[PDB]
Amino acid sequence: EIYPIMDKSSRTRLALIICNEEFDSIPRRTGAEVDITGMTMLLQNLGYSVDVKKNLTASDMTTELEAFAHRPEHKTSDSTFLVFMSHGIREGICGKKHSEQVPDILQLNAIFNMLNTKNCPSLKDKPKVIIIQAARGDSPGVVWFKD
Amino acid sequence: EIYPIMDKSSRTRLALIICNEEFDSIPRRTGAEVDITGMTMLLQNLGYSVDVKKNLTASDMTTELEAFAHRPEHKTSDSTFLVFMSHGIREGICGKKHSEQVPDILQLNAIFNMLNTKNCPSLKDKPKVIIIQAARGDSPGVVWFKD
Amino acid sequence: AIKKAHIEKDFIAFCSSTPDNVSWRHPTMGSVFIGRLIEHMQEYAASADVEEIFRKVRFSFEQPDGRAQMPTTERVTLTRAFYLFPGH
Amino acid sequence: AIKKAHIEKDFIAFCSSTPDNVSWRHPTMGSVFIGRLIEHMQEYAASADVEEIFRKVRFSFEQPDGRAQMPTTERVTLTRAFYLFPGH
Numbered sequence: 001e002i003y004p005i006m007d008k009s010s011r012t013r014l015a016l017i018i019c020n021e022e023f024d025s026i027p028r029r030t031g032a033e034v035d036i037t038g039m040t041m042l043l044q045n046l047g048y049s050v051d052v053k054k055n056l057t058a059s060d061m062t063t064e065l066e067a068f069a070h071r072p073e074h075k076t077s078d079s080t081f082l083v084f085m086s087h088g089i090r091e092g093i094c095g096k097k098h099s100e101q102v103p104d105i106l107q108l109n110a111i112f113n114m115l116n117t118k119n120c121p122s123l124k125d126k127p128k129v130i131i132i133q134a135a136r137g138d139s140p141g142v143v144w145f146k147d
Numbered sequence: 148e149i150y151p152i153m154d155k156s157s158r159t160r161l162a163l164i165i166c167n168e169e170f171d172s173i174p175r176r177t178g179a180e181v182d183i184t185g186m187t188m189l190l191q192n193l194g195y196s197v198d199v200k201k202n203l204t205a206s207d208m209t210t211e212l213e214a215f216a217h218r219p220e221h222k223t224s225d226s227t228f229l230v231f232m233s234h235g236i237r238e239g240i241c242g243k244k245h246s247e248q249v250p251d252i253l254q255l256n257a258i259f260n261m262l263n264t265k266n267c268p269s270l271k272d273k274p275k276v277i278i279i280q281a282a283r284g285d286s287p288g289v290v291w292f293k294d
Numbered sequence: 295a296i297k298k299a300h301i302e303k304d305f306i307a308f309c310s311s312t313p314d315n316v317s318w319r320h321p322t323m324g325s326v327f328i329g330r331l332i333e334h335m336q337e338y339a340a341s342a343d344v345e346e347i348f349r350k351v352r353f354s355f356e357q358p359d360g361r362a363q364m365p366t367t368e369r370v371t372l373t374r375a376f377y378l379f380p381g382h
Numbered sequence: 383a384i385k386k387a388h389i390e391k392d393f394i395a396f397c398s399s400t401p402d403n404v405s406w407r408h409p410t411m412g413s414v415f416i417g418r419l420i421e422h423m424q425e426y427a428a429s430a431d432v433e434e435i436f437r438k439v440r441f442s443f444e445q446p447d448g449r450a451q452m453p454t455t456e457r458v459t460l461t462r463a464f465y466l467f468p469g470h
């Protein structure tokens with residue numbers, strides 16, 4: 001009852017990391033380079049070929065994810081990893097040109113509809129790990145209690 | 148690394164089932180009585196005292212869930228079960244007076260904000276299982292493929 | 295005395311995103327999602343944790359033949375494994 | 383030949399709902415959420431499945447002392463257990 005792994009000699013594992021640190025209006029995400037270096041080194045040690053994309057809009061993130069789903073490497077792969085690192089709101093991942101007046105949001109539902117069986121038949125019956133990092137505009141998730 | 152269970156001799160496990168079958172505009176959910184009978188008998192065999200609520204609006208579901216969180220039985224309990232059975236859309240659970248023109252939706256985010264540590268301190272460090280049944284307006288989740 | 299505590303912790307949601315509309319033949323029939331859940335909850339209660347039980351429900355629905363069902367486990371905030379312990 | 387297949391299957395999302403804003407002291411510091419994930423991914427890769435690894439990340443964040451973090455595993459659609467198998 002375990003997911004069948006592919007032989008190391010003839011496999012093409014592929015992973016994608018989309019990170020946003022430089023922005024137009026919203027605060028800079030400094031120290032993100034350490035997060036990129038950490039995740040890329042980890043996934044590569046796990047056998048995944050890592051594609052890193054820096055500072056993209058919601059429209060650019062949609063196209064890049066759509067292009068990633070139609071890669072021929074997934075045909076001879078057994079699993080995949082998706083890493084999103086940016087600001088986060090109620091809807092989902094923020095883009096680089098996201099502001100209070102002009103919204104630029106990549107919806108989380110669109111990510112699942114991109115790697116799904118219908119739009120991505122190459123990753124059928126294959127584990128799809130989506131790691132998202134989204135800092136939300138709500139006070140630190142801690143509450144004090146009397147004991 | 149397992150959740151500490153409470154002694155059977157002196158515990159007050161409590162569960163809530165909210166089911167909607169009769170509606171004002173949207174189609175009737177016939178055969179829901181079998182789902183109620185099945186779940187109530189199951190949870191009672193697991194040690195939970197089951198409260199069953201039939202045909203409620205979003206406003207009534209909010210009050211009933213808020214009243215369930217402030218029950219003194221949870222103080223001497225170790226776990227809880229929440230069962231929602233109704234029609235479902237993009238937002239969440241539909242109410243009994245829900246229509247195309249007049250929406251009556253109980254949001255899923257409100258359920259988690261009701262049993263959370265801040266609004267429900269009695270269920271702190273205690274497992275909270277929320278089983279939802281929501282039939283969505285999308286064609287059966289199956290796609291054919293050539294092999 | 296004061297201590298910090300997470301606002302959202304020890305949660306597990308098990309909901310069916312797939313449609314479960316009423317059948318024309320047998321209108322009073324019980325739900326396949328609810329039915330299959332109970333079946334696994336009865337046999338695997340004294341052997342597996344609830345999060346692992348939901349996986350067994352997902353594993354049983356792997357091949358579609360009757361009603362197409364595939365439930366999703368959402369907002370998992372359980373730090374430990376929750377065993378039910380029947381009759382304890 | 384034709385066969386039925388679920389549109390959404392074999393998914394697992396591991397995201398932090400808790401805020402991870404940049405600190406005033408040490409501005410170039412790495413994320414505590416990303417850092418703790420890698421630490422568990424290195425040691426528990428050849429012993430536990432990814433879904434169980436995410437639980438170990440949640441178990442390590444049980445008591446808040448530094449940054450308050452509690453990640454949630456969402457839309458779990460994995461029928462089986464996914465072991466990584468390092469060096470295989």
Ligand SMILES: *SCCNC(=O)c1cc2c(C(F)(F)F)nn(C)c2s1
Nearest residue numbers: 108109255279309310311395456457
């Ligand atoms: S009970 C099933 C209902 N599901 C939801 O309420 C939603 C879950 C998500 C996610 C996820 F985080 F899983 F990716 N993203 N959106 C936009 C929703 S709605």
Ligand SMILES: *SCCNC(=O)c1cc2c(C(F)(F)F)nn(C)c2s1
Nearest residue numbers: 108132255256307368369397398399
């Ligand atoms: S990556 C964390 C972001 N989460 C989501 O996108 C949402 C998950 C849910 C749910 C849940 F199904 F978990 F209850 N309900 N809503 C309204 C959301 S949004």
